[PDB]
Design a protein around this ligand. Structure first.
Ligand code: CLA
Ligand code: CLA
Ligand code: CLA
Ligand code: CLA
Ligand code: CLA
Ligand code: CLA
Ligand code: CLA
Ligand SMILES: CCCCCCCCCCCCCCCC(=O)OC[C@H](COP(=O)(O)OC[C@@H](O)CO)OC(=O)CCCCCCCCCCCCCCC
Ligand SMILES: CCCCCCCCCCCCCCCC(=O)OC[C@H](COP(=O)(O)OC[C@@H](O)CO)OC(=O)CCCCCCCCCCCCCCC
Ligand SMILES: CC1=C(/C=C/C(C)=C\C=C/C(C)=C\C=C\C=C(C)\C=C\C=C(C)\C=C\C2=C(C)CCCC2(C)C)C(C)(C)CCC1
Ligand SMILES: CC1=C(C/C=C(\C)CCC[C@H](C)CCC[C@H](C)CCCC(C)C)C(=O)c2ccccc2C1=O
Ligand code: SF4
Lengths: 740, 63, 139, 80, 39, 43, 134
């Protein structure tokens, strides 16, 4: 029964509540007797569930809060392209994308910081960029600055509309709870319009604008000689010369004579030799196929015409012998709790973001991205990290659903109740797996690290010694190299040259080549499996044991965020679902940090490097990965100690900021250790003595000062531990790759 | 001490020890620690009040 | 003086002065920098060295900066001490700490230029220090 | 095992007994003219020592303390 | 309450404190005198 | 009302941001005209 | 000891080897209705209309359950301690009155007539075999 239900003018728009803080909560609204009130104000600002219990009030805040968030992203995205318009070398970069490095940031001639605007290239003095926005605009067919200047103003205009929306909705026209609960209507709309039509539209831009323009640009024509996009639409003579399939018109589409469009809807599946990047026609045929699949898929659900599926009926009818009632009650949990929806969306979105990073490096989808190793490395590293954070957030809100929104009446002998009733077996076996892998993933390094020191290189786990080869992956590789012909016959070249095939060379660089898998990759892939399993153990344990444990029978009453539940029973320290998330983040950081290290050294040693006319590929680090990555000292020597030479020696040059942020990052990491190792008890007694000196000199504060709370001290530490950690490798990855 | 009088506690192990506090009520009974007081500064638990004996108190100012 | 020479005549200093790397937008910022630094004392490496002995021959190093700081810093403490005391007489003390009463604060910020006089006045006879017997203490 | 000692600053709020997970504390009648109720700790053997009694006490400093000592199966919270 | 946490029993001038401290200060200036070549 | 807006500006962050930006701009602007200032040159 | 078991499929979270060897516990309660209640160690279970009985590994599981029972307006919950030899002892409402409410028959235990500040120092009591909290 889809319907638009709205409440008119629930909440006014006065500036009164701005002045008095803590309006959202009653405890904070009383007054700030203590400095912990300040920290609690921020920690409870987005805890709408604590402010009120009416789901209408919660959902209205959430739906409007999203709009204010989009304005921030649009202002950001519009801000990036604006810098490309005014302060940049993009117009000059198109003339020579292989000799001019991309820059869009300029720092003013104030104290000593004009050095950062070095000779990046093209007569422009600016900071070199690694986000890859230059390659995106070329994929968008943007060839002049005024074109970019127009798009930036459009984003700022779009920002006000989103901003106007959240005001209009929370204050003037607030939807009721029924408007959000019609799930079946929501999913049809997003799949078909937001994803389907949005994909179908982008196919139009690629076919009409990007593919023709880029087909002229790689040919060798000057940038000024390229016609504008509207010129292609009006004058069809120019379009037919490149893609003669358009001469037939739209009649082959309706008559199902779709082969006439083969020129610009190809299935080559390889990279463009001229510009390192996938073919625009292949990308053009991409979104058209995606849109039809999405448009069709979204009609599955009923949305108030009797035709379609009810998700409740799908889930309930998937019972089985082993699972008692199957998926019964999950629809009720997901329709009565925002945290459950947030946990599912975060977890799979994070895994998606990691899945993007692996596709992009092997299948570079933009022109000249592969030759820019700096953009390629930071791009992979970026999304790899963002996906790791979002996955951990999924476990947190998964546990928050348990303490706050779990209904035992609904979850009775269902798939979830049955999972909690054997949680001991889930963790005890996952405990066994984590120990098994940590021994047989890291112990093999120690055996190699120990043997090479003893002068016994024959007894190692190396390619000449006992080698454990990854036969399973090498088998899967050959199937992809042979997909040209046989299975997937119409494809001319494989989906990626990473699986195998011939080498591709752009200028003097190499875009991609076969990534051979040896003993080193067999070990590192297990190291990843080891580190991934442990954070799952930490996070999954918090979800199941948040309600109760053998130690604590009533853990839900204390809440999701409680420090200890006392010092007895031995010690109940960090027993909450919150503290599991706190611990899992360190392991998320540990696991994710080896992935990018596996990426950096392998791609530099095996893949990237200058290429000669005869095909001789002079790799960057000289193929040292196979015989050095098997030992821990090899990474310390060949990866960290050696490649960090550019960072420390960056002083007196344009990359000096990276050497500073690199060194400064170690500080914040160590500053984290104040809060993790210490405890609130010592610090409150220190403040006591300091308060005496103020009471002496009559500088005593009315707001009585107290040390930080326990969970805050843990939160403050992990924030520093990760910020100081990530910023370190951030500068090392940047300064090293930018020099080479 | 009479009600409504500012008073300086002398009990050690008290958060407000050697600090002034008003007298909100007094109990005419044989109970130990009969006097009830109230302070502007809250303790670590946020209670702001506690009962104390007569000998643990000085009359700083008149009621 | 220890293991150093005058900055004007040191060769290593003149060697760096030719390539000064002007900081600001002004082209001559580099040459103007090394010109003023000729007054100071320099070492073998070519960089200048400051002497915080307290001798009046070299007082711009630390002594003049020292006086300029303490006048500025005492302004901040005297202002904060006075603003905090004035609030305590009012009824709602905690809210005024967060939501500043600018009507009370800006008159105090207008003062503070004569903080040393008020400091001596409170020290000689006043409220610069509270008694030890009337302050909270642990057992 | 863990000794729970009560002092004369009790006022009969009973908030300690309600917080006890294991039902160690029990209110008892104060024969004097203070109140009709003052706390006690008869079943001290089941004191796990989670200090919930202390967090619930409204005094300046505690009317009831929990001095830790020897450990047992009942105190360590072991279900095995 | 067995022992007070604040001690008492002294006069404004503090002759004994000033006498020994001024001696320690007098030595500090004597060392500074040799450094500045006053002596 | 304007009385409510003034209270918002007088709060801790906005009062701190307005003040620190002013003190920052002074040091920032003074340093572009008077570049280096390692010490006070004494005549 | 009599009653009916709450109807649930079972759970790993529950009774272990300690029950056979030493001091398993039990809890009994009676409800007019038959609702769904969360068990002390994971899971959910229904409850019969008369004389429900559950075996628990510790005393903390029962009072934690009893607090949940009070949400359903059930105030008659009795906890036992079953030894390996079959000896059962009625514990939690040791008298008919609950602990939070006062009963005349009870006596004060481990009460110190002094305040905490009045306790002796450790140096005053060393090698005597007595503690400061006495
Ligand atoms: C047009 C002006 C206007 C006015 C006068 C109000 C007034 C009000 N709104 Mg409202 N609102 C507006 C626009 C406005 N809103 C818009 C445009 C949106 C859509 C985003 C909303 C969405 C909204 C929601 C969802 C809620 C309110 C609420 C409120 C009330 C309390 C707000 C408060 O005291 O917090 C004042 C808080 C601030 C001034 C801080 C806001 C910070 C902004 C939004 C984000 C800044 C991001 C920034 C880039 C981060 C940088 C970080 C780094 C650099 C440090 C109050 C009546 C709340 C309410 O009614 O409570 C029951 C509530 O739940 N409003
Ligand atoms: C049929 C038209 C079509 C075309 C021409 C492409 C073309 C492309 N896809 Mg693609 N794709 C398609 C349909 C298509 N897709 C559909 C229908 C799906 C959903 C299942 C996907 C899902 C998909 C993913 C997840 C990825 C690509 C990627 C790519 C690029 C890699 C190079 C290659 O050989 O293609 C590969 C083409 C295929 C593997 C064929 C898929 C056909 C499916 C199996 C049919 C579905 C039947 C139900 C290329 C631009 C990669 C990319 O974005 O590069 C950066 C990438 O990671 N595709
Ligand atoms: C879609 C993303 C998303 C959303 C909407 C939420 C939303 C929420 N989370 Mg959540 N979370 C997420 C992702 C998300 N989270 C991820 C990825 C993690 C893993 C790190 C967590 C971990 C997490 C925990 C552990 C907790 C929450 C909690 C909450 C709730 C209250 C938070 C609050 O008061 O905000 C205000 C939050 C703050 C003021 C903290 C500020 C943290 C700053 C931004 C860190 C600094 C990072 C910055 C980039 C550093 C550089 C700049 C700096 C140097 C200037 C709220 C419902 C809390 C809760 O009680 O839920 C019921 C809670 O306990 N979340
Ligand atoms: C380098 C430091 C370090 C090491 C080695 C470990 C090791 C471990 N942590 Mg961990 N941890 C650390 C730092 C570390 N942690 C930090 C800083 C934190 C805070 C965030 C945590 C937080 C944390 C949590 C939250 C969890 C772990 C878990 C684990 C275990 C995973 C199982 C495993 O790998 O098998 C054991 C593997 C090893 C011990 C690796 C080295 C073993 C070598 C190869 C063998 C030794 C040779 C020989 C036998 C020596 C004999 C000598 C003889 C003379 C006696 C393991 C014991 C998880 C766990 O226990 O799940 C099972 C878990 O849940 N840790
Ligand atoms: C107060 C005491 C103190 C101090 C000052 C230091 C100082 C240091 N420790 Mg340290 N440490 C201490 C106590 C201390 N330690 C104790 C007690 C322990 C426990 C044993 C440790 C454990 C420890 C470890 C484990 C590590 C250190 C490291 C370091 C170094 C940090 C590197 C760095 O940033 O260079 C200083 C350089 C800069 C700050 C310049 C670069 C940054 C620019 C200026 C950034 C911009 C800053 C800007 C002004 C403000 C940011 C604002 C912005 C957010 C808006 C430095 C020498 C780390 C290190 O580097 O060692 C190799 C390290 O790994 N220490
Ligand atoms: C109201 C202003 C004010 C004044 C006059 C003082 C005065 C003093 N502080 Mg204090 N302090 C203040 C605010 C102030 N504090 C604040 C806000 C904090 C929290 C960060 C502290 C935290 C603090 C510590 C932890 C310590 C002192 C100490 C001291 C002594 C000198 C050393 C020092 O730390 O420099 C001042 C340092 C600051 C960070 C000053 C902050 C300036 C405020 C924000 C300005 C107020 C603006 C006003 C409203 C307009 C001296 C008694 C030391 C001590 O115990 O004495 C022996 C010591 O160890 N202070
Ligand atoms: C009571 C106030 C007072 C005064 C006026 C001085 C004055 C002086 N001290 Mg001094 N000092 C004092 C207290 C004082 N001190 C205290 C309390 C200590 C103990 C930490 C010291 C420890 C101290 C050292 C360690 C040194 C001085 C030095 C000096 C001289 C610096 C050179 C100069 O005049 O310029 C100067 C005469 C320096 C000096 O004379 O070296 C030649 C020197 O090295 N002082
Ligand atoms: C074994 C595969 C699961 C086969 C599987 O899940 O069986 C699925 C089987 C099906 O039961 P039902 O037919 O009731 O499921 C019906 C569904 O509609 C209800 O969700 O259930 C079980 O046997 C439970 C066993 C779970 C525990 C199995 C061990 C899990 C090991 C951890 C995963 C290892 C992954 C390794 C490969 C990457
Ligand atoms: C050799 C110094 C002998 C001190 C002799 C001694 O112990 O005197 C101790 C005496 C302190 O006496 P008290 O005050 O402890 O007790 C005396 C009674 O009158 C207290 O009411 O101090 C003086 O004589 C004042 C002048 C001392 C000045 C000392 C400065 C020395 C600098 C050199
Ligand atoms: C000459 C010289 C020198 C020396 C110096 C010295 C050695 C000094 C010291 C000094 C001292 C040894 C002093 C002490 C003092 C003490 C005190 C005691 C302090 C404080 C005071 C007060 C009490 C304060 C108060 C206040 C005010 C006044 C204002 C602001 C606020 C406040 C409140 C903080 C040198 C070599 C460096 C250099 C060259 C020259
Ligand atoms: C250091 C530390 C503290 C003490 C840390 C404190 C008190 C942080 C204080 C942060 C700032 C400095 C508070 C004051 C900020 C000022 C009000 C800002 C002044 C205004 C100008 C800056 C404009 C804990 O409380 C703690 C608790 C649990 C585990 C570990 C620790 C721990 O390690
Ligand atoms: S003072 Fe503490 S122990 Fe005594 S009755 Fe109140 S809460 Fe219970």
């Amino acid at each position: 029964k889809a319907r638009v239900i709205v409440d008119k003018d629930p909440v006014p728009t006065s500036f009164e509540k701005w002045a008095q803080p803590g309006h959202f909560d009653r405890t904070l609204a009383r007054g700030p007797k203590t400095t912990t009130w300040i920290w609690n104000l921020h920690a409870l600002a987005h805890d709408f569930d604590t402010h009120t219990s009416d789901l209408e009030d919660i959902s209205r805040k959430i739906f409007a809060a999203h709009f204010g968030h989009l304005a921030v992203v649009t202002i950001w995205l519009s801000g990036m392209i604006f810098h490309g318009a005014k302060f940049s070398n993009y117009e000059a970069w198109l003339s020579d994308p292989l000799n001019v490095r991309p820059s869009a940031q300029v720092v003013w001639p104030i104290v000593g910081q004009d050095i950062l605007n070095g000779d990046v290239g093209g007569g422009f003095h600016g900071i070199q960029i690694t986000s890859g926005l230059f390659q995106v605009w070329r994929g968008w067919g943007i060839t002049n600055s005024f074109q970019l200047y127009c798009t930036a103003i459009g984003g700022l205009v779009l920002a006000g509309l989103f901003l106007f929306a959240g005001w209009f909705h929370y204050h003037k026209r607030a939807p009721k709870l029924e408007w959000f609960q019609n799930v079946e209507s929501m999913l049809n709309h997003h799949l078909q319009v937001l994803l389907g039509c949005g994909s179908l539209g982008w196919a139009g831009h690629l076919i009409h604008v990007s593919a023709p323009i880029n087909k002229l640009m790689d040919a060798g024509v000057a940038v000024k000689d390229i016609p504008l996009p509207h010129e292609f639409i009006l004058n069809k003579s120019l379009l037919i010369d490149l893609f003669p399939g358009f001469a037939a018109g739209l009649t082959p589409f309706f008559t199902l004579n779709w082969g006439q469009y083969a020129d610009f809807l190809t299935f080559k599946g390889g990279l463009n030799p001229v510009t390192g990047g996938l073919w625009m026609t292949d990308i053009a045929h991409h979104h058209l196929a995606i849109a039809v699949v999405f448009i069709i898929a979204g009609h599955q659900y009923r949305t108030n015409w009797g035709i379609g599926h009810s998700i409740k009926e799908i889930l309930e009818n998937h019972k089985g012998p082993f699972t008692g009632e199957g998926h019964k009650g999950l629809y009720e949990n997901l329709t009565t709790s925002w945290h459950a929806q947030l946990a599912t969306n975060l977890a799979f979105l994070g895994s998606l973001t990691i899945i993007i990073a692996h596709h992009m490096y092997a299948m570079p989808p933009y022109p000249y991205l592969a030759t820019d190793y700096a953009t390629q490395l930071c791009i992979f590293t970026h999304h790899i990290w963002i996906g790791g954070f979002l996955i951990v957030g999924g476990a947190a809100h998964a546990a928050i659903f348990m303490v706050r929104d779990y209904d035992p009446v609904v979850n009775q002998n269902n798939v979830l109740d049955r999972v909690i009733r054997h949680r001991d077996a889930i963790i005890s076996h996952l405990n066994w797996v984590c120990i098994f892998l940590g021994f047989h993933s890291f112990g093999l390094y120690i055996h190699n690290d120990t043997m090479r020191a003893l002068g016994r290189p024959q007894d190692m786990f190396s390619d000449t010694a006992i080698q454990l080869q990854p036969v399973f992956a090498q088998w899967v590789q050959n199937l992809h190299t042979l997909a040209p012909g046989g299975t997937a016959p119409n494809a001319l070249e494989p989906v990626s040259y990473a699986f195998g095939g011939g080498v591709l060379a752009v200028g003097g660089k190499v875009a991609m080549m076969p990534i051979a898998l040896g003993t080193a990759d067999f070990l590192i892939h297990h190291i990843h499996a080891f580190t991934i399993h442990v954070t799952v153990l930490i996070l999954l344990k918090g979800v199941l044991f948040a309600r109760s444990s053998r130690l604590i029978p009533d853990k839900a009453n204390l809440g999701f965020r409680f420090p200890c539940d006392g010092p007895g029973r031995g010690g109940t320290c960090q027993v909450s679902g919150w503290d599991h998330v706190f611990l899992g983040l360190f392991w998320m950081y540990n696991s994710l940090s080896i992935v990018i290290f596996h990426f950096s050294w392998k791609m530099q040693s095996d893949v990237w490097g200058t290429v000669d006319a005869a095909g001789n590929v002079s790799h960057i680090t000289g193929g040292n990965f196979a015989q050095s990555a098997i030992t821990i000292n090899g990474w310390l020597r060949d990866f960290l100690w050696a490649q960090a030479s550019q960072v420390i020696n960056s002083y007196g040059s344009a990359l000096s900021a990276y050497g500073l942020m690199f060194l400064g990052a170690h500080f914040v990491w160590a500053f984290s250790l104040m809060f993790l190792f210490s405890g609130r008890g010592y610090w409150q007694e220190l403040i006591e003595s300091i308060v005496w000196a103020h009471n002496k000199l009559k500088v005593a504060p009315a707001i009585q000062p107290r040390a930080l709370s326990i969970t805050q001290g843990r939160a403050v530490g992990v924030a520093h531990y990760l910020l100081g950690g990530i910023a370190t490798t951030w500068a090392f990855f940047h300064a090293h790759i930018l020099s080479v | 001490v009479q009600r409504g009088s500012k008073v300086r506690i002398l009990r050690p192990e008290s958060y407000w020890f050697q600090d002034v506090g008003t007298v909100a009520s007094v109990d005419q009974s044989g109970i130990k620690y009969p006097v009830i007081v109230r302070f502007d500064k809250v303790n670590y638990a946020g209670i702001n009040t506690n009962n104390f004996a007569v000998d643990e108190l000085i009359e700083v100012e008149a009621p | 003086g220890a293991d150093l020479t005058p900055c004007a005549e040191n060769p290593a200093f003149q060697a760096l002065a030719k390539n000064a790397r002007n900081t600001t937008a002004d082209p001559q910022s580099g040459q103007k920098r090394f010109e003023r630094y000729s007054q100071a004392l320099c070492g073998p490496e070519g960089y200048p060295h400051l002497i915080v002995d307290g001798r009046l021959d070299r007082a711009g190093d630390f002594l003049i900066p020292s006086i300029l700081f303490l006048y500025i810093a005492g302004w901040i403490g005297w202002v904060g001490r006075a603003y905090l005391q004035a609030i305590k007489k009012d009824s709602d003390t905690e809210q005024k700490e967060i939501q500043l009463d600018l009507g009370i604060a800006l008159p105090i910020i207008a003062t503070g230029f004569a903080w040393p006089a008020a400091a001596v006045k409170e020290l000689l006879s006043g409220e610069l220090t509270a008694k030890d017997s009337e302050i909270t203490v642990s057992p | 095992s863990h000794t729970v000692k009560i002092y004369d600053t009790c006022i009969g709020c009973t908030q300690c007994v309600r917080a006890c997970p294991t039902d160690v504390l029990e209110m008892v009648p104060w024969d004097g003219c203070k109140a009709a109720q003052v706390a006690s700790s008869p079943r001290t053997e089941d004191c796990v020592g989670c200090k919930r009694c202390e967090t619930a006490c409204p005094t300046d400093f505690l009317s009831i303390r929990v001095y830790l000592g020897a450990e047992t199966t009942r105190s360590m919270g072991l279900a095995y | 309450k067995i022992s007070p946490v604040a001690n008492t029993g002294a006069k404004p001038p503090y002759t004994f404190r000033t006498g020994w401290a001024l001696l320690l200060l007098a030595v500090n200036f004597l060392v500074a005198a040799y450094y500045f070549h006053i002596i | 009302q304007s009385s409510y807006l003034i209270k918002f500006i007088s709060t801790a962050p906005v009062a701190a941001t307005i003040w620190l930006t002013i003190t920052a701009g002074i040091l920032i602007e003074f340093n572009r005209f008077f570049p280096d200032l390692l010490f006070h040159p004494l005549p | 000891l009599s009653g009916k078991t709450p109807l649930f499929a079972g759970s790993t979270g529950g009774l272990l080897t300690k029950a056979v060897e030493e001091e398993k516990y039990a809890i009994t309660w009676t409800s007019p209705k038959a609702q769904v209640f969360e068990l002390p160690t994971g899971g959910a279970a229904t409850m019969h209309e008369g004389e429900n009985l559950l075996y628990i590994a510790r005393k903390e599981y029962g009072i934690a359950l009893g607090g949940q029972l009070r949400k359903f307006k059930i105030t008659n919950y009795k906890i036992y301690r079953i030894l390996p030899s079959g000896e059962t002892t009625f514990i939690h409402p040791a008298d008919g009155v609950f602990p939070e409410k006062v009963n005349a028959g009870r006596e004060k235990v481990r009460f110190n007539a002094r305040s905490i500040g009045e306790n002796p120092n450790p140096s005053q009591v060393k090698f005597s075999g007595k503690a400061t909290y006495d």
